[PDB]
Design a protein around this ligand. Structure first.
Ligand SMILES: *[C@@H]1O[C@H](CO)[C@@H](O)[C@H](O)[C@H]1NC(C)=O
Ligand SMILES: *[C@@H]1O[C@H](CO)[C@@H](O)[C@H](O)[C@H]1NC(C)=O
Ligand SMILES: *[C@@H]1O[C@H](CO)[C@@H](O)[C@H](O)[C@H]1NC(C)=O
Ligand SMILES: *[C@@H]1O[C@H](CO)[C@@H](O)[C@H](O)[C@H]1NC(C)=O
Lengths: 504, 51, 51
């Protein structure tokens, strides 16, 4: 589409050579700054070389500006159950004379338990006292050593993905297109590097917007059913039992098993109970739908409406009413890149065909320009009020661009130049005025709103009172019409008073 | 990096003395090699009959 | 950023993986990210900090 907000910060900053024989470049390094634009615009970065007449540009596309958060940590908490077993034996020797552990023996496995398995998981080797005598099965009036082992299992295999965060910094999407032809996408943050690709390090800056009731919130998501929910989650390994934050592990593929080497649990996550050689285990682990402040996919806590935006690396978003933020300018840095220049530009001349659009408003005024040349794309339009750059194709085609005007009757003379050749163009048409749209029920904001033009807010006497019916004749006609209406309303009022007076 | 054993790689407008440089590389059967710093590898057996 | 001179305490880069991916996200804040970030011309209080 169109383009605006040119920079030209590092023009004529090359140290190239003959260029592989005919024409090439080596590297271009500098720094520029891109101001904030409305969602659905393009910011071009036009370079200028001292030898070549014109060069290509670098367009920046922004679609949505959502309110996301960072990633403090990442872990997976699997579902657990209650499993336990025991064994009843007899003393029959000096191994169980008085107590089971003499001083510190915790290895309560006599090469018979089922703990030496890959699906067992984590547990605690405990022990207690039992019965001694003929009524239980032995021949000694002394308690027998009865050991017990409990653990957790996962029959189903439901895997959850929790990501704690307490920053909630503004972010957006960027569809960057390199001048060579490659087009990629990435999600920059507010002041955080965004995986620099081929030297380009375009970053986004915010305004540090405060939150109303966002203190302890997370972005726990489900993998199988793809169910999302907003609920306060725990912190890193050093945690407290009582809320979310049960037995975790290393990764998702390692979350199917609750074995050691990756799974971490502190203490007191499963209870033990026994009356007579039973050693039964009860369940105390709570599910995800058990803590307080457990929301769902649609969340309207406060002024923010947390929706579920389909996007990679993040599935949490939200958009309040029109905010009109202060500034959202970018910052682009370069380290190294290659670009080819033709420098063989020939005679080119264009003209204006159509013109339409709004007043000085959001979408602007779109103007169609037709060109004809042999070069693929060498053009740079420059005029007063606003500057717009775009790309063309080989041959004769039609192109549509948008410019910013501040007058109803757009009748001026701009200068158009493609490559090294220059010419003159003219614009002539009628435009209209559109204000900021109003809110309607049933509709919710998706990403954000940038800004709305509400500066003038005053009627223009030049455009107004034009299609109603030179100035002297108009004043005379208005005066005659006013006198006629005055006589009419006087006659009507006299008739009304006459009707009210009589026939009482 | 500008030149590797008398082979033009980049544009530096000047050459310096040789110096060792540790970097991984791979071949695809072409003329020159391709060096790579960040790469993710995966070992697969596939139970091929050639093995 | 090699060792033997560079100092970092802990928890400066996170790790995330679902199925043999091991993707790393960025958490380091730039200089223009903390609060109370002024510029070359500063007039905080009665003092006019110039350069
Ligand atoms: C739920 O939110 C309310 C309001 O913010 C808060 O007072 C309460 O402590 C929260 N509950 C939990 C368990 O954090
Ligand atoms: C220019 O003429 C009208 C005016 O808007 C427009 O509908 C038409 O599509 C334009 N011409 C071409 C060739 O696109
Ligand atoms: C111009 O475009 C045509 C077709 O898109 C392409 O074949 C040609 O290589 C382009 N020229 C240059 C110099 O890139
Ligand atoms: C910024 O300055 C204000 C006023 O001096 C202070 O209250 C606030 O804590 C400062 N911010 C930080 C992050 O130190």
């Amino acid at each position: 589409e169109s383009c605006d907000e040119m920079v030209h910060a590092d023009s004529k900053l090359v140290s190239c050579r003959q260029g592989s024989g005919n024409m090439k470049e080596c590297v271009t390094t500098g720094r520029a700054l891109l101001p904030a634009v409305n969602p659905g615009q393009e910011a071009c970065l036009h370079f200028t070389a001292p030898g070549s007449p014109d060069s290509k540009c670098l367009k920046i596309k922004v679609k949505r500006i959502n309110l996301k958060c960072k990633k403090s940590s990442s872990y997976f908490v699997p579902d657990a159950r209650s499993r336990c077993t025991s064994v009843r034996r007899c003393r029959w020797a000096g191994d169980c004379q008085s107590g089971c552990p003499p001083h510190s023996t915790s290895n309560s496995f006599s090469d018979d338990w089922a703990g030496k398995m890959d699906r067992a998981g984590l547990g605690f080797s405990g022990c207690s006292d039992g019965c001694g005598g003929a009524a239980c099965g032995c021949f000694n009036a002394a308690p027998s050593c009865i050991f017990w082992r409990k653990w957790v299992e996962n029959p189903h295999g439901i895997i959850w993905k929790v990501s704690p965060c307490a920053a909630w910094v503004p972010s957006a999407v960027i569809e960057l297109t390199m001048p060579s032809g490659e087009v990629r996408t990435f999600h920059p943050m507010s002041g955080i590097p965004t995986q620099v690709f081929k030297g380009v390090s375009v970053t986004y800056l915010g305004s540090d917007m405060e939150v109303s009731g966002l203190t302890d919130l997370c972005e726990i998501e489900e993998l199988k059913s793809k169910k999302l929910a907003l609920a306060p989650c725990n912190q890193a390994g050093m945690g407290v039992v009582g809320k979310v934050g049960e037995i975790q592990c290393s990764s998702e593929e390692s979350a199917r098993t609750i074995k050691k080497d990756g799974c971490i649990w502190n203490a007191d996550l499963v209870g033990i109970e026994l009356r007579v050689d039973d050693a039964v285990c009860y369940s105390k682990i709570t599910s995800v739908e058990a803590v307080a402040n457990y929301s769902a996919i649609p969340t309207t806590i406060g002024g923010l409406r947390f929706e579920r935006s389909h996007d990679s690396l993040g599935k949490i978003s939200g958009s309040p009413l029109d905010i009109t933020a202060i500034r959202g300018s970018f910052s682009v840095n370069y380290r190294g890149l290659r670009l080819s220049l033709s420098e063989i530009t020939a005679t080119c001349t264009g003209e204006v065909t159509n013109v339409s659009g709004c007043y000085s408003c959001m979408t602007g005024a779109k103007v169609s320009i037709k060109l004809h040349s042999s070069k693929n794309s060498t053009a740079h339009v420059r005029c007063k009020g606003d500057e717009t750059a775009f790309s063309v194709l080989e041959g004769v085609h039609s192109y549509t661009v948008s410019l910013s005007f501040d007058h109803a009757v757009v009748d001026e003379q701009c200068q158009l130049n493609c490559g090294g050749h220059e010419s003159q163009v003219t614009l002539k048409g009628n435009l209209i005025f559109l204000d900021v749209p109003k809110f309607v029920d049933g509709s919710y904001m998706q990403t954000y709103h940038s800004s709305v033009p509400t500066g003038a807010n005053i009627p223009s006497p030049t455009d107004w009172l034009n299609a109603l019916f030179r100035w002297i004749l108009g004043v005379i006609g208005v005066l005659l019409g006013g006198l006629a209406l005055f006589f009419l309303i006087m006659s009507l009022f006299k008739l009304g008073t006459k009707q009210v007076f009589r026939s009482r | 990096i500008c030149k590797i054993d008398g082979v033009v790689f980049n544009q530096c407008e000047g050459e310096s003395l040789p110096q060792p440089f540790d970097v991984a590389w791979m071949d695809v059967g072409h003329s020159h090699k391709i060096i790579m710093r960040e790469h993710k590898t995966k070992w697969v057996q596939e139970s091929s009959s050639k093995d």
